[PDB]
Coordinates of C-alpha atoms and ligand atoms in Angstrom, one line a residue:
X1 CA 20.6 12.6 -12.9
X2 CA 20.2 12.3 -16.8
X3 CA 19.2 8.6 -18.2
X4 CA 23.0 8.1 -19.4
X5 CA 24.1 8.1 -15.9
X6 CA 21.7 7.1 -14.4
X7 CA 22.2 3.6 -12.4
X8 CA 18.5 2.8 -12.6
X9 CA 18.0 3.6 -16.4
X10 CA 18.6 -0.4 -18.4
X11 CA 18.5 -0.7 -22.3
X12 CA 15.0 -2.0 -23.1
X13 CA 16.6 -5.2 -24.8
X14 CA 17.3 -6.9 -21.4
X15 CA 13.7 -7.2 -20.8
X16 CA 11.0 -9.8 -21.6
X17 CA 7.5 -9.3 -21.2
X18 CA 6.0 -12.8 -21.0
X19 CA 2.5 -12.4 -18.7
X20 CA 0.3 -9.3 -18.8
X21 CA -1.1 -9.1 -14.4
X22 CA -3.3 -6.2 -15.3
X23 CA -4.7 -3.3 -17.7
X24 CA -6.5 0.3 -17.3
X25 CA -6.4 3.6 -18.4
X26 CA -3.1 4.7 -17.4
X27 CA -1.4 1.1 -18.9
X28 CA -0.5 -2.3 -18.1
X29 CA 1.5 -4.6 -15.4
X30 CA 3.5 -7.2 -16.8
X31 CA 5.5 -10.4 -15.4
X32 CA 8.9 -10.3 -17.6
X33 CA 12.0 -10.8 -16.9
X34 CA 15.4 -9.2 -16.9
X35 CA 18.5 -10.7 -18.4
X36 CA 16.9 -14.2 -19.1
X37 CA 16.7 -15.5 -15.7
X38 CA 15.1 -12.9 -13.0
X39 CA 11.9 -12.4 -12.6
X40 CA 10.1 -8.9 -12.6
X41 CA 7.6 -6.8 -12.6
X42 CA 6.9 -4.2 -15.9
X43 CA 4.6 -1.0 -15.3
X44 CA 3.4 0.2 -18.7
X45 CA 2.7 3.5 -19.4
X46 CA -0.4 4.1 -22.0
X47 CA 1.6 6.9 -24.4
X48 CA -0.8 9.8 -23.7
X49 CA -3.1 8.6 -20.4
X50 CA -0.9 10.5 -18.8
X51 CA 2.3 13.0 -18.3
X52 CA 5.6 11.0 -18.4
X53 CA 6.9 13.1 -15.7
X54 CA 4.0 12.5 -13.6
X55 CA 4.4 8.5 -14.5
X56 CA 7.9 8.7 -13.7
X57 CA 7.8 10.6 -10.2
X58 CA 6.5 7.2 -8.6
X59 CA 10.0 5.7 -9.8
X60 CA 11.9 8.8 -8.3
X61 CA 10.1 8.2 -5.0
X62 CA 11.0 4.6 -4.7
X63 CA 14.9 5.7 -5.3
X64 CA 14.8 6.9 -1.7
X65 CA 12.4 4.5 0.1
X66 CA 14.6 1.6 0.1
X67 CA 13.5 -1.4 2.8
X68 CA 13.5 -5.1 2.8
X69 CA 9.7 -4.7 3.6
X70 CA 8.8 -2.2 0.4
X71 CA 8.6 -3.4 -2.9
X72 CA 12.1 -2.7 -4.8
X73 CA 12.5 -0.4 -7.7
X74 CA 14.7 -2.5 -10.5
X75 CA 15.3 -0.1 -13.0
X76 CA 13.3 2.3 -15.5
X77 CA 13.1 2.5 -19.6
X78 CA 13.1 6.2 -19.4
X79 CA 11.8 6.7 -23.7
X80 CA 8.6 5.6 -25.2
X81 CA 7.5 3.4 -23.7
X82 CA 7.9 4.3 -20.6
X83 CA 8.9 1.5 -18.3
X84 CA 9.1 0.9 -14.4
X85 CA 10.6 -2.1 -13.6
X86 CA 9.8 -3.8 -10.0
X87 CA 11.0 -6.9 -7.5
X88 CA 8.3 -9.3 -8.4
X89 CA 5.5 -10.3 -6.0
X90 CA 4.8 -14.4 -6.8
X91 CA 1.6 -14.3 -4.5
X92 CA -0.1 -11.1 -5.9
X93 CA -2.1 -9.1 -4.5
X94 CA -3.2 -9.3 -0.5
X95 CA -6.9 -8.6 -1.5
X96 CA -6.8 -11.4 -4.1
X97 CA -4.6 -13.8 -2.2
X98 CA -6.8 -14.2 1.0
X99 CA -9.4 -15.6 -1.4
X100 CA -7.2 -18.1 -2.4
X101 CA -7.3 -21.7 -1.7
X102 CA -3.6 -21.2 -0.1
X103 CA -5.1 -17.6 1.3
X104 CA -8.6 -19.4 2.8
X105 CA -6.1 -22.0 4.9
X106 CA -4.0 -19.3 6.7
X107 CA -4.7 -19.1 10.6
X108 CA -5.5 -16.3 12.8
X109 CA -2.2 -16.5 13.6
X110 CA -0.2 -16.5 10.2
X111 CA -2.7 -13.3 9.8
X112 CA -1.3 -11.2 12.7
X113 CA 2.2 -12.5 11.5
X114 CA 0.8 -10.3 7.6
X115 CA -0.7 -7.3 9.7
X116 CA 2.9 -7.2 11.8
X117 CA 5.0 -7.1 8.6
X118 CA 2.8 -4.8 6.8
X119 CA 3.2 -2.2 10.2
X120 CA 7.2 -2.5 10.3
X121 CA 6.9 -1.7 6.2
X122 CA 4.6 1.5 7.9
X123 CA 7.0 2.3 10.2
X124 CA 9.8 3.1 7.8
X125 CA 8.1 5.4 6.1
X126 CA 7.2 6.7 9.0
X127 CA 10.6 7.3 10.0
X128 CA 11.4 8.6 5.9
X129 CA 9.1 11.2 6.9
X130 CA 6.5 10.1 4.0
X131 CA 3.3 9.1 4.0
X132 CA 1.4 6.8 1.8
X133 CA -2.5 7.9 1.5
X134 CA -2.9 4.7 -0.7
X135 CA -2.7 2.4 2.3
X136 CA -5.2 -0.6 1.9
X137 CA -4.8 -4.5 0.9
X138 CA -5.4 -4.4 -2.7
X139 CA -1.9 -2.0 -2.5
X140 CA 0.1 -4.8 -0.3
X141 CA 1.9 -7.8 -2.1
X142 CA 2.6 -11.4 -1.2
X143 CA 5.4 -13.2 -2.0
X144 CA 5.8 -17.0 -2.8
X145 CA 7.2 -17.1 1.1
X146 CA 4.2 -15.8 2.1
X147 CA 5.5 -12.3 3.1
X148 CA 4.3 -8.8 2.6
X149 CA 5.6 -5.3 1.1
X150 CA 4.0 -2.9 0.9
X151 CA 3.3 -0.9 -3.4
X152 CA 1.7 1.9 -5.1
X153 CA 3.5 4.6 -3.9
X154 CA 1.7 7.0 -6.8
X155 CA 0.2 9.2 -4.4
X156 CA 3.2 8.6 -1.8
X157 CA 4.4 12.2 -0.3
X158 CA 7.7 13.4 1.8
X159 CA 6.3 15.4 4.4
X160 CA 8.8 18.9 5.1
X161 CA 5.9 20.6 7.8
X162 CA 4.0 17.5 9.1
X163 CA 1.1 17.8 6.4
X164 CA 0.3 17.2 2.9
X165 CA -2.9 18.9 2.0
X166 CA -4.1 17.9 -2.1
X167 CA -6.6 20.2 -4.1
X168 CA -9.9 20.7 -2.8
X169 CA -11.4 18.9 -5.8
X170 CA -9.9 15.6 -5.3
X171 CA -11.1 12.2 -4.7
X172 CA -10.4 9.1 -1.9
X173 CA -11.9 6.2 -1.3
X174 CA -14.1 7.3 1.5
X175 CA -14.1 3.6 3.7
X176 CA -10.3 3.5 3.5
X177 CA -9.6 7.4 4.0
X178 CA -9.5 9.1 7.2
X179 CA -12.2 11.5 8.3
X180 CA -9.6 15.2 8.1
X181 CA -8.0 13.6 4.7
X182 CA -11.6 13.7 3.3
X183 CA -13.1 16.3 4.6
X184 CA -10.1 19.1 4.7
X185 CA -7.9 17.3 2.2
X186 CA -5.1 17.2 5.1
X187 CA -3.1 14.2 5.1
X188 CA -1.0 13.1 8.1
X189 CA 1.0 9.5 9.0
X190 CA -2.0 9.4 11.3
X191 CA -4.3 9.1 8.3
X192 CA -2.2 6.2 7.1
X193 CA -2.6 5.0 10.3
X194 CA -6.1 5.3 10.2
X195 CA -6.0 3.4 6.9
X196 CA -4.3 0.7 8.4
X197 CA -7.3 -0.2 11.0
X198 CA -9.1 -0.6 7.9
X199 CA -7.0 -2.9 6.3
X200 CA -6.6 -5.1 9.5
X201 CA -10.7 -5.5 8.9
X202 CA -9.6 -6.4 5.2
X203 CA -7.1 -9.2 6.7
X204 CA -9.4 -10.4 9.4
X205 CA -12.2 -11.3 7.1
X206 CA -10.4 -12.5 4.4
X207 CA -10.7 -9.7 1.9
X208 CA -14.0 -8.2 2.4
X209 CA -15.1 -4.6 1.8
X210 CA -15.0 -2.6 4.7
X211 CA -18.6 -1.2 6.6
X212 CA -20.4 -4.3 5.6
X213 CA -24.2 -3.3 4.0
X214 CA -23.4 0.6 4.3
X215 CA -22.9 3.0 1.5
X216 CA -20.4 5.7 1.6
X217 CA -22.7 8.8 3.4
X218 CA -24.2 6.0 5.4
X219 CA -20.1 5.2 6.6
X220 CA -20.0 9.2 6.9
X221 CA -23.0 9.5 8.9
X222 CA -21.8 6.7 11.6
X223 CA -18.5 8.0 12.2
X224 CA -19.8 11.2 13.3
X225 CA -21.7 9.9 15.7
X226 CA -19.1 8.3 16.9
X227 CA -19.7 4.7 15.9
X228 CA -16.9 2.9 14.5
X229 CA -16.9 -0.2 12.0
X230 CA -18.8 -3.3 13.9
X231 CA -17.1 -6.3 14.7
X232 CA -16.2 -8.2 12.3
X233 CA -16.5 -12.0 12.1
X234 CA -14.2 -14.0 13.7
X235 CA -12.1 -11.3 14.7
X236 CA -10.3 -11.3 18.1
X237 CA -11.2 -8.9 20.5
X238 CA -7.6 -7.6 20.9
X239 CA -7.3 -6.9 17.7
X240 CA -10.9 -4.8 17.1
X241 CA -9.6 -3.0 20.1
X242 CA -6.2 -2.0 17.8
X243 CA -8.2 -1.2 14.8
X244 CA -10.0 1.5 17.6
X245 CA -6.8 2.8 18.4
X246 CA -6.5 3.3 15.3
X247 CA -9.8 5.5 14.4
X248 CA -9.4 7.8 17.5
X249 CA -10.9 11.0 16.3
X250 CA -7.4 13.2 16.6
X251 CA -5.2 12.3 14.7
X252 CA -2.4 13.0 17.5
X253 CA -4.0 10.2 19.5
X254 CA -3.4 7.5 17.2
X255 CA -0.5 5.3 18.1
X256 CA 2.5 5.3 16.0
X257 CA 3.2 2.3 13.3
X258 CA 6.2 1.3 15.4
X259 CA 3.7 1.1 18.3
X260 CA 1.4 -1.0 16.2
X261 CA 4.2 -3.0 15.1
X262 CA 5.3 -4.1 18.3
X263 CA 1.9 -5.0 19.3
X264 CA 1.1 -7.3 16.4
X265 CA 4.4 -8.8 17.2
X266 CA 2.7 -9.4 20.9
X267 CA -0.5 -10.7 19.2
X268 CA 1.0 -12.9 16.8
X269 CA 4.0 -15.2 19.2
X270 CA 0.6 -15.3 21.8
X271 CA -0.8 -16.9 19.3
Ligands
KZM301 C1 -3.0 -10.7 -11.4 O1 -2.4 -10.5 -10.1 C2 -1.1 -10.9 -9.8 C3 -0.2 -9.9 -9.6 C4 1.2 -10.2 -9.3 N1 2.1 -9.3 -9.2 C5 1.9 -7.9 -9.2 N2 0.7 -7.3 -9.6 C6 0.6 -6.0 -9.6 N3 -0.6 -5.4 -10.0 C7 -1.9 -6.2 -10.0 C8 -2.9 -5.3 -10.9 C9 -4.2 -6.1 -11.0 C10 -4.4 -7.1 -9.9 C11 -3.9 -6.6 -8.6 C12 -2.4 -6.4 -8.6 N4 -2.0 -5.3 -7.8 N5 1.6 -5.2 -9.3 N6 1.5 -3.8 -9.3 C13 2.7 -3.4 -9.0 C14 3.1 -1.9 -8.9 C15 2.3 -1.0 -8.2 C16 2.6 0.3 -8.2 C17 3.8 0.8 -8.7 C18 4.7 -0.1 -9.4 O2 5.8 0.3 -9.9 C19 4.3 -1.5 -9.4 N7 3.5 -4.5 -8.8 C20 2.8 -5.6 -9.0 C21 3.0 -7.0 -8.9 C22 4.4 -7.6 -8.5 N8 5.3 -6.7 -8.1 O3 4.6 -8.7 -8.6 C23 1.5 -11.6 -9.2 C24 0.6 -12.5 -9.4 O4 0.9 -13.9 -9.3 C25 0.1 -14.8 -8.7 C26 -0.8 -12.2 -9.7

C-alpha cells in the first residue's frame, strides 16, 4: 500500500525527538513524542548503513503481529529519514532493568510473573506462525507497570513449511542460539524455544551472561556431551527443570510456548 494511503505513514512534523536511548551503525533510538502529548519511541535509520527496504521490512512485519504482549508499531516516516515509530517502553530494557535498584528488589515471584508474560507474548507468535531467532532479554522491554513485550523483530520470519533456514555464512550469538540454528542454519519455534531457557537463566540471575566462565567452543563442547548450563544461583529447582525442557536435543521434544506459559502461570500463583 503506497505512503499516501497508507494508515501507518504520519507527516514527520507530528513528531518530537527529545531523548536519544541508543546509537550504532545502523542509527539511533529516540524517546519523542507524537502530537505533543504521547510518548514514543523513534528508530533512526543511518542514510546509507543500510537498504531502506531492508530497514523498513521490520515495520511491515509488526503490521501483522499485533498483541497486547508485543511492542506496538505507531506509525512510519517512509522518506529520508527513515523513521519507525513504536509504543514506548518507560522501564527499558529487561537486561538493563534487573540491574536496577527497582530491578535488584523484585522477588522470585514477580520474576516468574516476567518469564510467564514474556511466554504468552511467545505463544502468539507461535500461533502467527513466525518465529523470532532474536529471542533473549536485552530484546524484551519493561514498562513503567512493570510488564513485558516482547521487540526486535529484525530477524523475525513467517514460517509457510515449518523452517526458516538463513545463508550458510551467517552469524548468532552462539549462548542464546539453538544447537541445529547454528550448526545447519535451520530455524524452528523450537529454537525460540530453546532461546527462551536461556533467557529464564538471564531473569533468574538478574541479568547475567549465560554459561558462566565458558567461552563460546567451551559452551559448544558441553552441549554435545550432553551437559546443559549449571544451576544457576538462587534459582528454583522447578524452574532449572523448565529451562531442561527447554534444551531437549530434538527440537520436536521441546514443549510448546503455550505449554510453558501455563506452567509459569503454575510457578508464579505457587509462589
Ligand atoms: C537507554 O535504555 C532505555 C530504553 C528505553 N526504551 C527503548 N529502548 C530501545 N532500545 C535500547 C537500545 C540501547 C539500550 C537497550 C534498549 N533496547 N528500544 N528499541 C526499540 C525497538 C527495537 C526494535 C525495533 C523497533 O522498531 C524498536 N524500542 C525501544 C524502547 C522503547 N520502545 O521504549 C527506555 C528507557 O527508559 C528507562 C531506557
Amino acid at each position: 500500500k503506497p505512503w499516501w494511503e497508507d494508515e501507518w505513514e504520519v507527516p514527520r512534523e507530528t513528531l518530537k525527538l527529545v531523548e536519544r536511548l541508543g546509537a550504532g551503525q545502523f542509527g539511533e533510538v529516540w524517546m519523542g513524542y507524537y502530537n505533543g502529548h504521547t510518548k514514543v519511541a523513534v528508530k533512526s535509520l543511518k542514510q546509507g548503513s543500510m537498504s531502506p527496504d531492508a530497514f523498513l521490512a521490520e515495520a511491515n512485519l509488526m503490521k501483522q503481529l499485533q498483541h497486547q504482549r508485543l511492542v506496538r508499531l505507531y506509525a512510519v516516516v517512509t522518506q529520508e529519514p527513515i523513521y519507525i515509530i513504536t509504543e514506548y517502553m518507560e522501564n527499558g530494557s529487561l537486561v538493563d532493568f534487573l540491574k536496577t535498584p527497582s530491578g535488584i528488589k523484585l522477588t522470585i515471584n514477580k520474576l516468574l510473573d516476567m518469564a510467564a508474560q514474556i511466554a504468552e507474548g511467545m505463544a502468539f507468535i507461535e500461533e502467527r506462525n513466525y518465529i523470532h531467532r532474536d529471542l533473549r532479554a536485552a530484546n524484551i522491554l519493561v514498562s513503567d507497570t512493570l510488564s513485558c513485550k516482547i521487540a526486535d523483530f529484525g530477524l523475525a520470519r513467517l514460517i509457510e513449511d515449518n523452517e526458516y533456514t538463513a545463508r550458510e555464512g551467517a552469524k548468532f550469538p552462539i549462548k542464546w542460539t539453538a544447537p541445529e540454528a547454528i550448526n545447519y542454519g535451520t530455524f524452528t519455534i523450537k529454537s525460540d524455544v530453546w532461546s527462551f531457557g536461556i533467557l529464564l537463566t538471564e531473569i533468574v540471575t538478574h541479568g547475567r551472561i549465560p554459561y558462566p566462565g565458558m567461552t563460546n567452543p567451551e559452551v559448544i563442547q558441553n552441549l554435545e556431551r550432553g551437559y546443559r548450563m549449571v544451576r544457576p544461583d538462587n534459582c528454583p529447582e522447578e524452574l532449572y527443570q523448565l529451562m531442561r525442557l527447554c534444551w531437549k536435543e530434538r527440537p520436536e521434544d521441546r514443549p510448546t510456548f503455550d505449554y510453558l506459559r501455563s506452567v509459569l502461570e503454575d510457578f508464579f500463583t505457587a509462589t
